[PDB]
Design an enzyme around this catalytic site. Structure first.
Site, PDB file in Angstrom:
ATOM      1  N   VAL A  66       6.534   3.043  -1.289  1.00  0.00           N
ATOM      2  CA  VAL A  66       6.470   2.201  -0.124  1.00  0.00           C
ATOM      3  C   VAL A  66       7.645   2.357   0.785  1.00  0.00           C
ATOM      4  CG1 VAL A  66       6.337  -0.085   0.777  1.00  0.00           C
ATOM      5  CG2 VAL A  66       5.151   0.505  -1.364  1.00  0.00           C
ATOM      6  N   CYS A  67       7.362   2.537   2.047  1.00  0.00           N
ATOM      7  CA  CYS A  67       8.388   2.631   3.044  1.00  0.00           C
ATOM      8  C   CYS A  67       8.544   1.273   3.755  1.00  0.00           C
ATOM      9  CB  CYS A  67       8.078   3.760   4.016  1.00  0.00           C
ATOM     10  SG  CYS A  67       9.350   3.976   5.263  1.00  0.00           S
ATOM     11  N   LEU A  68       9.609   0.556   3.436  1.00  0.00           N
ATOM     12  CA  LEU A  68       9.810  -0.760   3.976  1.00  0.00           C
ATOM     13  C   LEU A  68      11.323  -1.053   4.112  1.00  0.00           C
ATOM     14  CD1 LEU A  68       8.278  -3.354   4.757  1.00  0.00           C
ATOM     15  CD2 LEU A  68       8.530  -4.070   2.384  1.00  0.00           C
TER      16      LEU A  68
END
Length: 159
Positions: free
Chosen positions: A93-95
């Site tokens: 996840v890119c967050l």
């Protein structure tokens, strides 16, 4: 060991979660081959939000903590990987909150993380594409996009 600080926080997190968490969410530590509890590797599940194309799906995610946690954020990874503009092909996840150099704060809890991710599901960050496919479709053909998502939520509907 030197993981004392991390383990201690992780135990507090587990405890607080059991105490209170969002309906439909799952977050539980894994077991070591020896039937023991591995606090550094959690198995989680995020429910699709109501009234969205994600609605109805139950998305499984793995949370991996480092020895220095909570200095560093955990690595969050969808298993299997999801179709979404901000999820790398690896399922990672890119967050922003998941990046030390960005918005990560040691005080952020597991619940917040999970809620953040859920929120991310229907509110992609067009500025930070993690994958070519989902990002393109999203930009080029919203209709098809929702369509893909729906089929996806359907594939991951809990019994």
């Amino acid at each position: 060991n030197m993981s004392g600080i991390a383990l201690s926080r992780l135990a507090q997190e587990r405890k607080a979660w059991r105490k209170d968490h969002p309906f439909g969410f799952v977050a539980v530590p894994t077991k070591n081959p020896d039937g023991t509890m591995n606090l550094m590797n959690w198995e989680c599940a995020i429910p699709g939000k109501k009234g969205t194309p994600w609605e109805g799906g139950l998305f499984k995610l793995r949370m991996l903590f480092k020895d220095d946690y909570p200095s560093s954020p955990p690595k969050c990874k969808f298993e299997p990987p999801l179709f979404h503009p901000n999820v790398y092909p690896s399922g990672t996840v890119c967050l922003s909150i998941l990046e030390e150099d960005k918005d990560w704060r040691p005080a952020i809890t597991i619940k917040q993380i999970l809620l953040g991710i859920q929120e991310l599901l229907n509110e992609p960050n067009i500025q930070d594409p993690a994958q070519a496919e989902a990002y393109t479709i999203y930009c080029q053909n919203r209709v098809e996009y929702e369509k893909r998502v729906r089929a996806q939520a359907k594939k991951f509907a809990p019994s």
